[PDB]
Amino acid sequence: SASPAVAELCQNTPETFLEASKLLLTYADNILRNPSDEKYRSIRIGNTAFSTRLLPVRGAVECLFEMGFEEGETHLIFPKKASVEQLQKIRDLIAIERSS
């Protein structure tokens, strides 16, 4: 498990790292723990939290892409084809760094 996105995410300041990694864990966990709830599979690119606290942060959007999200015009979508396994892998990597 050697993620370029997670390594980049860890290069942020402690404060920003915490803020962004927290959001990333929530996006992952909501899908992992509610796999039949479609509402957790799409994130609006213009959502205030997402656009201001996640997207501007080096490494963070790439963590979503490595999890399996795809970028549409207005949303990032976790598609039907995407494995929980790859999603879980990135969640686990980020959580280690938050405990670290």
């Binding site: 996006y27 509402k39 799409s42 994130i43 609006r44 959502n47 939290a49 997402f50």
Partner: peptide, 5 residues
């Protein structure tokens, strides 16, 4: 704080 919509 809504993260989705």
């Amino acid at each position: 704080d809504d993260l989705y919509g």
